[PDB]
Symmetry: D2
Subunit: 425 residues, 4 copies
C-alpha cells in the first residue's frame, strides 16, 4: 500500500522566487570540524555556487566559491547541483550562511562543534532508512522536538527510496531533499550509503552504482585519505566516526579494506575516546527480514572491532530497532565448533536503528525466542540519540513515534571501552 507523502504535501513545497535555492543541506567538510560542505540545487538556471557567510561573533561577511554539476538518470535530467566548502571556521561558534546570491537569496545557520578533546560533550542523532512516508515525517518531528537537542545526525543509509518508483523517478530525490532541509540545512547529517542508494538498473542502462546519491550528497572523504566517498572518517567533539560501505568491495587488499585497517591504527583514544562505526547492513540482527545478510562483512571486520575496542556500531537496513549485548563470534575455525556468540566486554554494542519510516512498513517478524546476544528489540518506528557526557560515559536512548517526544522507550549508559571498561550490560 502507498504510504509515501503525496507530491503536493506541505513538506515538499518549492521555495518561492526565481531560481530559489532548494534542497539545501550541510555536512562536515574536513577531518576535525573547521569546515562545512554546503550543498543545494537550483532549478531554473545554473546560478552561482558562491556562499556568503559570517559568524555572530565577528559579523564579517565572507565568500566561499564552489562547483556546479548535473546528471541524467534514464529520462530524468537533474537541476543544477551546487557543492561548496567553507573552510577555517572557528570552533563552537554560530555562523549564518546564504545561498542563491545572484537571484533569490536564502539564509540559514549552523554551529561549529567544539574542538576535539577527551571530555568534550556532544549529542548525536541516530536516524536510519528515513524515506518520505508519513511515518518518516513523524520521526523527523520527534527528532527536532527532542529535549536532548541533537547537534549532528548520524545517518545509517537508505535516504529517499526513490528507487521504488518507476525508473527510480529521480523527482523523488528532489522531494526528499526539500523535506529533509528543515533539519539538515541547520546541522550536519553524516551520510552512510545503503542499498537503496545503489540504483544498479542495467535494464535502463544505469550501471554506475550510487550515481544519484553521489552527485547529490558529498562527503569529506579525502580528509581521511579515503579514495572513495563511500567509506571515510570524521572527528567531531570527542567522537571518532568511521563510515563503511556494505555494498562496496571489502575483501583483503581492496581499497576499503586497506583504508579501514590503517584508519583503525590511526585512532587515538586519548584524543577522541568515543569510537563509533556506521554501516548500513547490521552485523547482528535477529529479525527475519535480511536475516544473516551482515554475515560476510562480520567475518571480515568483527575481529578488528573487538581488537580496537569499538564502543558502538550503528546500522539500519532492518526496519525496526535492536540493541545487542556486548558479544563477539570470532573464535570460529571451520572445524572447532565455535560458532556461538559469547559475552565479550571488549566488543562494541551493535544497534539497529533503521526504523525512521522508510515507505511506511515495519519489520515485525522476529526469530523466536530472542537470542542471548540480543538485549532489546522492538518493531516500532523511531529514532535514537547518542549523548556523550565525557570520556567515560555516554547515554543512548531510543524514542518511539507513538510516545511523547520526551519519552525514552529504551535507554542505556555506555561505559567507554578504553577509559572505563566496566560491565555496562
Amino acid at each position: 500500500k502507498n504510504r509515501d507523502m503525496p507530491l503536493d504535501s506541505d513538506v515538499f513545497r518549492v521555495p518561492p522566487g526565481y531560481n530559489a535555492p532548494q534542497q539545501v543541506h550541510i555536512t562536515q567538510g574536513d577531518l576535525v570540524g573547521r569546515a562545512m560542505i554546503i550543498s543545494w540545487v537550483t532549478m531554473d538556471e545554473p546560478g552561482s555556487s558562491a556562499v556568503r557567510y559570517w559568524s555572530e561573533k565577528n559579523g564579517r561577511k565572507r565568500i566561499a566559491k564552489g562547483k556546479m554539476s548535473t546528471y541524467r538518470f534514464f529520462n530524468y535530467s537533474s537541476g543544477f547541483i551546487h557543492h561548496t566548502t567553507i573552510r577555517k571556521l572557528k570552533y563552537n561558534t554560530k555562523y549564518y550562511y546564504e545561498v542563491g546570491l545572484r537571484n533569490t537569496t536564502r539564509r540559514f545557520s549552523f554551529i561549529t562543534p567544539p574542538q576535539t578533546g577527551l571530555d568534550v560533550p556532544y549529542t548525536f542523532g541516530l536516524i536510519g532508512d528515513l524515506g518520505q512516508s508519513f511515518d518518516s515525517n513523524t520521526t523527523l518531528s520527534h527528532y527536532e522536538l527532542s529535549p536532548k537537542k541533537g547537534q549532528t545526525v548520524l545517518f545509517v543509509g537508505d535516504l529517499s527510496y526513490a528507487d521504488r518508483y518507476p525508473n527510480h523517478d529521480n523527482v523523488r530525490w528532489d522531494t526528499w531533499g526539500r523535506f529533509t532541509e528543515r533539519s539538515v540545512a541547520y546541522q550536519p547529517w553524516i551520510w552512510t550509503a545503503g542499498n537503496h542508494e545503489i540504483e544498479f538498473a542495467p535494464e535502463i542502462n544505469e550501471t554506475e552504482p550510487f550515481k544519484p546519491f553521489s552527485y547529490r550528497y558529498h562527503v569529506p572523504y579525502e580528509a581521511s585519505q579515503s579514495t572513495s566517498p563511500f567509506w571515510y572518517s570524521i572527528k567531531r567533539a570527542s567522537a571518532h566516526i568511521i563510515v563503511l560501505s556494505s555494498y562496496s568491495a571489502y575483501g583483503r587488499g581492496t581499497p576499503q579494506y586497506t583504508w579501514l585497517k590503517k584508519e583503525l591504527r590511526k585512532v587515538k583514544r586519548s584524543e577522541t575516546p568515543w569510537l563509533i562505526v556506521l554501516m548500513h547492513s547490521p552485523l547482528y540482527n535477529s529479525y527475519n527480514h535480511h536475516f544473516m545478510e551482515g554475515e560476510a562483512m562480520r567475518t571480515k571486520f568483527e575481529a578488528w572491532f573487538v581488537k580496537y575496542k569499538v564502543d558502538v556500531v550503528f546500522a539500519g537496513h532492518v526496519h525496526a530497532y535492536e540493541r545487542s549485548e556486548r558479544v563477539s563470534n570470532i573464535a570460529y575455525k571451520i572445524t572447532n565448533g565455535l560458532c556461538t556468540p559469547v559475552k565479550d566486554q571488549s566488543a562494541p554494542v551493535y544497534i539497529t536503528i533503521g526504523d525512521a519510516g522508510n515507505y511506511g512498513v515495519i519489520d515485525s517478524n522476529m526469530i523466536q525466542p530472542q537470542p542471548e546476544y540480543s538485549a532489546f528489540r522492538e518493531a516500532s518506528f523511531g529514532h535514537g540519540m547518542f549523548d556523550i557526557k565525557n570520556r567515560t560515559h555516554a547515554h543512548f536512548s531510543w524514542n518511539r513515534n507513538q510516545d511523547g517526544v520526551a519519552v525514552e522507550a529504551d535507554s542505556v549508559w555506555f561505559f567507554n571501552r578504553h577509559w572505563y571498561p566496566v560491565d555496562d550490560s
Copy 2:
C-alpha cells in the same frame, strides 16, 4: 630471496625488427567460441591495430580492425597496446593470424574449439599465481610439454607480480607479457583477477583498482551481460565457465551479486554439462596462509553453488595445492550450532591450484591435523589439467615441477553432478 628471472633472460627477449609486435596474447572473444580477442604491444610507434587472419583450409585472408590504447602508472609510460576482436569464425578450425601489418609482421595461429555440446571432449590447463620466477618458467614448460595437451588455460589470478617491485615497476608487466607469449599467443587463457592485479597504491597516487591489468588484458564481459571485466562467463566445448572477482563487491544487490544470481539461471546442463567456477581466493583452504580469507564470499555464494550443482571451483591465492572432498557448510543460522562442513553430493569439489611459481615461495604451513573436508594437499609447485571426456566423466590431474612432465602426483575422476552424481571421493 629474489628468485625472479633477471631482465636479460631468454624468455624476456624482445622480438627483433622495427616496431615488432610483442607480448602477443589471445582469449575467447565471445560467449560460445566463434570469436577471439587478439592483444599485443608495440614499443616504437603506435602502429596498426589491424589483424590479418585466415583458416589453413579455405585461406581467404581477412582483416579485423581494433583499437590502440596507452596508460601511465606513476613514472611509467606504457607502449602502445592493441586489442582487436576477430568474429564469426568457424568451429574446430585452425586459423593463422598476423599483427604488425605496417612494419614488422609476426604470424601465429590458434585452433577454435568445437561448437558447444553435451558430449564434446576438451582439455583445460589450470594455472594460478604464475609470476616470473625460475619456478614459473618450469611450470609453463611442464604445461606445454604435457602429453595430455591442454587446449585452453583457465588462469585463477595473480599474473606478473609486478606490484612487488618499487613503484610496481610496470616493466615487469612487459616482461611477463613476453614470457607468456610462447603460450597464450597460440591458445586462449581465461583470466581471473587476483589480489596482485589490484595495484591499489594511494602513496604514489595510483588509486584505480586493476588499472594495469585491465588495460593489458581484455575479457568478453559484455557477451554474458556483465557490466564489468572482473566477473563474466564463457561457454567452450562442453563447459560453462563462471569467472568471479574476489576483490570486487559481492554484497546483496551489488552488480556482481546480481549478475551471478541471473547467470546461474542461464546455465543449461544439457548443452554444457560441466559447470566450472573460477575465483582467486579459495572458499575451502586448510593452509595457515590466507586461512579463512574466503569466508565472506563463502557466506554469499556457497549455497548457490550447491543449488546449481557446480562440478568444480578452482582458486589460487595460496601457494600450494589442495583438493577438497565434496562438502557443504551452508546450514548455519547463528544459534543452531550447525557450523561443520558435511559431505554433500550436490556440492562442488574445491581445488586450490595457486602453485605455478609466483616469486618462488611455497606455502608449507598447514592446519593440523588435516580436516575432514580436505581430501589431498601438498606444498609443491605445479599446475593442473581438467580433461573432459564426456558428459559424465572428467579427469583432473596435478603435475608437480619436481616430477616428470608425464607424472600425476594426484589425479581423480570427476563424476558430473547433473549427469552422473555418484560418490567420486578419493
Copy 3:
C-alpha cells in the same frame, strides 16, 4: 516578430510513445554509397538502430549507431541519434525505419548514380533558412519545383535559435521538425554559418558550434578532414568543397592545410563540376556585411582561379546576387592593381542566402552596381543548379512571390575544364 509560432502545423510532434522526430539525412561517405541517418527521441533514450532495405527485392538489414545528449544553459536536449548506413547500391531507392523499440516511422531516399564525367544531377540551393513564414514558403517552392531537386546544398544559418533568449534551443527542435518533410527524404549538405557559432560567454557557453555540431553530423573523415566544419564529398558529376568562414584559415592552420591538399585531389575527368560552399560571400555588393569576405578572399581566391572552380555559393547576406567571372588577385600593396578584372578561369560567385531567415530582406545595395556584379535582387527565394553533362549546367533562381515554375534569373554555366566559353 515573424517567426512561426510554436503551435504551427509544421512544428507538430509525431504521435506515439517516443516517436522519432527531427529526422534528417546526409551523405555518409565520400562518393555516395553511405548515408547518415539522424533523429531525436524525447520520451526516453530508445534505440539507435536503423532498419533499411532496397525497394528492388529488399533484404532487411539493421545498422547500429550512437546516442548523445547535451545541455545549453538551462536547456537539456532530447536523445540524439546518429547512424551510418554503408555499402549501399547506386541509383536505387531505399526505405529506412527508425524508433524500432516503440514507435517506428518509415522514410526513404534514393542513392545518387556512381560518380562520372557525364552523370546528370540537380542540386537545390538554400541558405539562411530559419523558421519564419518566408522560410516555410521557400521550402514549399523548392519541393514543388518542376526541376526536382535531388540534394540540397545548404550554405549556412539554419534555425536562427540564437536570436531567442539564451538561444532557446527548443527553437532547434522546432526547426528540425519543420525541415523534416524535405531532409528526411534527401540529403542536405551542411555548411556552418555565423548563427551556428553560438558563442555566449555571458551564460557560460563558450564552445563554438556546440548545438549545431551535436544535431548535424557530416562525413568529414571521409575526405581526411580533422573537423566537421570543412570537408568535401562527391555526388554524381560534382566535387563539392565545404569551407568554414568562422574557423581559422591562416596559413598552416588545419583548414588551410586541408583545402590546399584537397584541391590537388580534384579530378575534373571524373567530376567536371567543382563547387565550393561557404557561408560568407567573397563577392558581395550589398551594404549588409559588405567586405566581410575579404579575409578569406585574400587567402583562397588565387586558389579558386588556379583550380578553375566553376561556382562558389554563399549565404549570409539576405538577398540574391550573381557575379561575373572576375578575379582580384594581382594586388601587391603598392602596385595599384586593386580592381577585379574579367577572368575566364575564375568561378562565378553566387549569394543565395535569401531563404527566409527571420523574415528580413537585405535591400540596401552599393550604388551604382559594380562591374563585377552581374545580377542582384532583394527577394526571398532559392536556387537550383542543374547539371546536364560535362559541359553544361543550368542555374536558376526562383522568387517566393512568383509561381513555382518561374525563374526570375537564369544562366547557363559552361564548364571551366571541358567548355570554358564566356557565359
Copy 4:
C-alpha cells in the same frame, strides 16, 4: 645547413639531483601584475606542484599549490609538467621562490612590476622566432647583457622549432626549455603563439593545434575574460598589452574577434598610456618571405588599431628586422582604387622583430625598392627593446648580434598617440 645547437651543448644541461625541476619559466599570472604563473618540468617522477615563496622584505614563507599534467605526441611521452599560480603579491618587490620541494629544491627570484600608473617607467625586451641555433644563443646573451636592463620579454612567437625535427621530436621542446631558463625563470616572458606552435600533424594522428605549446606554456587568459590561451590581455606598469592569434579564427562573430572588439573598448589611456599589440604574422612587411600573409588579419583589425590609436604593433615570422612609418590602408572599397597605404599619424608603428635566430637562417630577399610605408629594414639577427620613460615618450632600439651589446643599429623615439600626438617620424 643544420645550425641547431647539438644535444650536449652546455645550454641544454640537465640540473643535477634526483627529480630536479628543469625548464623553469614564469609569466604574469593576473591582469595587473600581482600574480605570477610558475612553470617547470620533472623528469624522474611526478613530484610536488607546490611552490614556496617569500619577499626579500618580510617573508613570511608561503606555499602555493599547483597542478601537474603530461601529454604524449606520437611516440614521445613528456615528463611531468607543473603550473602553479602565486597570487596577491606586493608591487615592486623582489620575491624568492623554490620548486621541487620533495627531493631536489631549486631557488629563483623575480621582481614584481610597479603598480600601473601614467608615468611608470619600464623596459620590455622584444624577441621573436628564437629557436635553438647558435644565433639563437647569441641573441639571448645580447638581451641579458644589455645596458638597458630588460625587465620583461614580449615574445612574438615561434619558440623551439621542435616541429622541424622528425615527428616533431618533442625532446627539442625540453632542450629549448632548459636553454631559455637562464632568462625566463627570473622574469616573465609574455607568449604569442606562432606558426611553429601549431604542430598540425595528421599524418601521425596529431590533430590538435598548439598541443605541446599549450601544455608547456600557460597564460593568464581568464583574467581578461578571454576563453582561450591564444588571445589575451595584460597590464604591466604603464602598458596595456594585447596578444592575438594569427592562426586562430578571427572572422566576424568568432571568439577572438568578439573578444578583441570588447577588449579595445576597455582600454583606458588615462590609466595605461601605452597600447601595445602582439601577433605573430606582420600586417606590414616588405620582405619577400611571407609577403602579404598578414593581409587577411589586416582587413579585419587594422581599422580597429587606427580607431583606438595603438602605439605600436610587434610581430615576428619574417626572419629579419623592419620598422614601418605610421601608415594606414583602410579606405579600400573594392572598386574605388584606394589601395595604397598613406601616412596616418593616428596609426601604430608596425615592427617586425622575428630575427632572434630561428634555425640559423636570415630572410634577406626584400621587395625593391623600399616602399614608402617602410621606415627602416635590415636582414640581421638581433632583438629589440621598448623602453618606456613616461606617459609621452618611449624609446625603441634594435640591437644586432654582430654589434656590441651596447650598440643600437636602429633607434627611434615614440610619441604617445594619446598623450603626445605629434608626428614622430624619423
